[PDB]
């Protein structure tokens, strides 16, 4: 995959890192919320009252 090895593609990747990281944060928060994961929701203060 040597097509995308250049300064323009590196600049595009660097520009799209924070949006992808924010979407990964969205996915992780949604996964923890939907599965009701005890490894994280036991640490958030207001969520502790339902356990």
């Amino acid at each position: 995959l040597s097509r995308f090895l250049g300064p323009r593609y590196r600049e595009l990747a660097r520009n799209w890192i924070p949006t992808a990281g924010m979407w990964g944060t969205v996915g992780a928060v949604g996964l923890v919320w939907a599965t009701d994961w005890r490894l994280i929701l036991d640490w958030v203060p207001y969520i502790n009252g339902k356990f």
Binding site: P7, R8, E11, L12, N15, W16, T19
Partner: protein
């Protein structure tokens, strides 16, 4: 050799003086044997109050039909006698009366311009003849589709303000205005502090200043009732006007957002953004190898007949957007691709396209400032809008300070999640309505 920097700094400076009336007198000297001398007045359709909506246009028609000192065509006989060219134009904010002549005919030309600004005899028979002329030229101007589309865009973008109304005005006002309305408009909006005498080419500044002292001194300087007009900001409205007429062969669509204005420097950055998108029409020889992605996809998919980008600026407002001409069955696709390019400039601007846009803007500015007429035009607009003539070195500095990060920041400030004004004319059924365009004004992936 000399690089771009000292070639720009070797341009002669525009020297500005001021008379006792407040009339600005600005000139720039070159080695040409010809010259362009014009008068720029801060008076357009924005200063009209819907009862005199065609006063500037109709005065622009009447201004060459004779004065008190030079009655009738003898006046234009004089501007034939030296072989000079006489032009005038009116916009929504500025009016210009300019003469291209030789250098040695510099005094009489200035004297001629003096008559045109303060001695115009408005004969009633000439008023009727120019009324019929204005009616027939509106009857040919509505055949030109892009003027109709840009007037529709101005109307729907500046609803309820004096910036919606056209320069020509409605036809009822053309049938209605008399000589006294023209006299009141002439005594209200032709004030000496709102006037610039601009000269470009083979002119001496001291001789031009002496001629302005001789002829252009004591124009009015006084509003005669202590009733000074004030410029009022215009409300922008995200809206849509759709003039459907299916018998036309081609459709013209303009989409714009609110511009920053004359004095806001990020205009320069926005100009670079326009240079990334560029212009296209069907006679361009580039083929599929055009650098603009919109032009390349238009050639590849046979979508548009033409498109262009505009940054129209008025006093702290403006319209920034794109106008395209295409057949009906392509319209929606064109809109989609156009919006994608805007969002790419809001999200994924790279350094190479920014460098290309900066080079295109440098070429555009220097190639536009060529000849005595566009230099005089730039001097008049610069003294009316900025209050000073911005030199090309300052433009080059403001261009070279633009990088990709501030370009996508300013583009996100002005394009992303903004309500546009849409004006369509022709077979525009497949032109999407306001929800689809408004949803295309942002991306769900940012």
């Amino acid at each position: 050799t000399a690089t771009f920097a000292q070639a720009l700094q070797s341009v002669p400076e525009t020297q500005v003086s001021i008379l006792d009336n407040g009339l600005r007198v600005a000139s720039e000297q070159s080695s040409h044997a010809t010259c362009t001398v014009g008068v720029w007045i801060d008076a357009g359709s924005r200063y009209e109050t819907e009862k005199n909506n065609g006063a500037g246009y109709f005065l622009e028609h009447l201004a060459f039909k004779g004065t008190k000192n030079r009655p009738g065509n003898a006046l234009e006989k004089e501007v034939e006698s030296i072989g000079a060219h006489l032009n005038a134009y009116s916009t929504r904010e500025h009016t210009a009366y300019l003469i291209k002549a030789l250098s040695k005919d510099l005094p009489k030309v200035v004297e001629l311009l003096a008559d045109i600004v303060q001695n115009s005899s408005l004969e009633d028979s000439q008023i009727e003849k120019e009324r019929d002329v204005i009616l027939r030229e509106m009857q040919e101007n509505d055949a030109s589709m892009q003027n109709v589309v840009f007037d529709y865009l101005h109307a729907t973008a500046f609803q309820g303000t004096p910036l919606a109304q056209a320069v020509e005005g409605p036809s009822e006002n053309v049938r209605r205005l008399s000589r006294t309305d023209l006299t009141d408009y002439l005594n209200r909006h032709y004030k000496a502090p709102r006037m610039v005498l601009a000269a470009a080419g083979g002119v001496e500044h001291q001789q031009l200043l002496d001629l302005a002292q001789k002829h252009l001194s004591s124009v009015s300087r006084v509003y005669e009732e202590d009733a000074v007009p004030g410029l009022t900001p215009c409300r922008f409205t995200g809206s849509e006007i759709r003039h459907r007429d299916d018998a036309l062969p081609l459709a013209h669509v303009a989409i714009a957002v609110e511009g920053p204005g004359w004095a806001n420097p990020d205009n320069v950055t926005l100009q670079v953004a326009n240079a990334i998108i560029g212009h296209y029409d069907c006679t361009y020889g580039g083929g599929v190898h055009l650098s603009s992605p919109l032009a390349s996809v238009a050639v590849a998919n046979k979508l548009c007949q033409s498109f262009q980008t505009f940054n129209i600026s008025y006093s702290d407002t403006g319209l920034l957007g794109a106008h395209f001409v295409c057949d009906a069955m392509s319209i929606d696709d064109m809109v989609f691709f156009l919006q994608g390019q805007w969002m790419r400039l809001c999200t994924s601007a790279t350094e190479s396209e920014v460098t290309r846009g900066k080079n295109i803007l440098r070429n555009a500015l220097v190639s536009h400032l060529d000849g005595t007429t566009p230099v005089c035009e730039d001097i008049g607009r610069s003294l009316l809008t900025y209050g000073r003539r911005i030199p090309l070195a300052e433009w080059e500095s403001r261009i070279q300070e633009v990088d990709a990060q501030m370009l996508r920041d300013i583009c996100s400030k002005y394009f992303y999640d903004q309500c546009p004004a849409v004006a369509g004319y022709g077979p525009i059924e497949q032109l999407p309505d306001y929800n689809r365009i408004r949803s295309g004004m942002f991306w769900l992936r940012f």
